[PDB]
Amino acid sequence: EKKKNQRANRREHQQKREIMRFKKSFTCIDMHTEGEAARIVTSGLPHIPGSNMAEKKAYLQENMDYLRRGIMLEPRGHDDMFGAFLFDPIEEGADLGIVFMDTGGYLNMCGHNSIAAVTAAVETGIVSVPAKATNVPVVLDTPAGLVRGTAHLQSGTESEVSNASIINVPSFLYQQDVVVVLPKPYGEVRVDIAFGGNFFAIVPAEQLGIDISVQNLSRLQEAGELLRTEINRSVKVQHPQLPHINTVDCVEIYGPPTNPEANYKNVVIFGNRQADRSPCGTGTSAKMATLYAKGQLRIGETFVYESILGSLFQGRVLGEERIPGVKVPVTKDAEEGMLVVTAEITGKAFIMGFNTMLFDPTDPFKNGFTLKQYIW
Template sequence: MRLLIPCVETHTCGEPTRTVIGGFPNLPGETIRAKQVYIQEHLDHVRKSLIREPRGHRGMFGAILTPPVSPDAVCGVVWFDNAGYLSGCGHGTIGVGITLVETGMVPASGPLTTFTVDSPSGLLRLSVRAEGGRARETSFENVPAFSVGSDLAADVPGLGRIHVDIAFGGNFFAILDAAQAGLEIRPDKASHLAEVGLKIREAVNAQVPIRHPTMPHLDRVQIVTFVAPPTRPGARYLNTHMFGDGAIDRSPGGTGTSAVMTALYAKGKLAIGEEVVAEGIAGGLFRGRLLRQTALGDRPAVVPEITGPAYITAFHQFVLDSDDPWAEGFELH
């Protein structure tokens, strides 16, 4: 049996998003989280096929568009990477925004097209800016973000004791200065960043208990963020994010920028409305700010906004053949 999966490919400051726009059966579930669980339990072979070699690679990232579950949303989205599924993705949100407007799935309405998208972590409010007849960048109002704690200690084999800030920006992040781990944020150091990031994540999750106040299934750090002084004029910091099974985010990171801003705010180092420019390992820039204070259950929270560019790179029709011995792909480490 052959399954045809149409996708639109984008990159956001160098980080890919493979957006599935069709080919899936009707997905049961009244929430995007329920649809995500259904895909994970019944259709995970599709994720593996699209992410792994020979169709993908270790750093590939994906999105599956679904029917909306909220009255005002244009669609839903499920995020996936080389290890499984995520509750949020900022670079992917930017890429999906460009995809929806550039392909006409969401009709453009002048220089700024606004709409909402359902995600596993909540409703995302997108504004896609057009210039010269082209969609250029997406701003999105993220779900509420909050700090778990600042300068939390964890003992990491081979590193000793480190201190991290933990914040939720759509995913849970452990944030630390790269120098604390003896690292440099450079493209030629990506493998080492990934290796150390995996060790830090394992140690933090074993030693620091966390749980989202309204989504209790989110109870572990998914992403490790390394921060260093910027190299681009105007940037506040340079960072990269280790996610999945040792993948390195090429972009400045959308949920990552949300988490870093939230950690800075918790330390009194960032004000509501103050703009932050974040630099990614590939040299791209995102703009971010905290729009307002809010609450998440009984926990104080903030609402981040992130802006960045994305570009369509390809339109694919993937063929998944059940007779293919490598239909679910493979991984090289």
């Protein structure tokens, strides 16, 4: 009896250690930022060259797209998964290197994921907290530049984060009152184009004729897709100092708030008819840049943006600059130079899982799949 179960358990032990022999694994911290997923890969990635984060992202995108697909798509992920790969920092001042992605492709900047990364870095001990600290800087070296994060620690704890802030890369209004003639039932609409880490078309829900609600999400997704498509066919949008960045990525649709604390509600449509569940950090930065450029938001004033789910992000414009010699369609005098703003965005991320992802060399879905169709 006893020998039989002792022999049994040892065979069972042997089976277990056989598992991860000759199988690739990555370790991940699964977070969400007010409903939006962020899979942060902390170990197991192949070694990637690059003398800066933009070059690392280019390498990934050119040579190792299979990493993204397998981690983001079904069956390990799903069509609304977002994520990030952590690397050593390169740029002076940074704590962590990071490259973002989603089910469509690798990305330059992502605000909700940056908030999640700052949070996870502190809560899991990736960066040290000096004794007695109540705020912990976490500076991210991203393909879009340096993103200066702060984890705000819960009082009484050494590493529990109440919420996190990021200082985004420079944001700016790009072009104003752009008319786009969309098919019925939408008709013509007037939008702003702004950059907040990604380019956004910002448009009022009222122009589209649709109230922002979960039940209207498919209508919003289709309006968003139509608008984005027609913009990139008819309007030249390019970053005037980072020329790798040059098309309209997202459509930010805003309307009246449902929560009293918020200025506005929004939903961001991006990728292939996807919607952000969070209020969207770079989209919030872009909105604040636009409001600022129009005299509707003061430096230091708190701006609160609500998502389709009711979540809030808070932000503030910290400062502005002109860039002598550089211009965008909204800039009046190239001499004076274009107006940029520095914005901080704050929100809350939660740890939802510690994951070890496995890739069997004989799994035909080792690189994932999607069932979502691009409708052309």
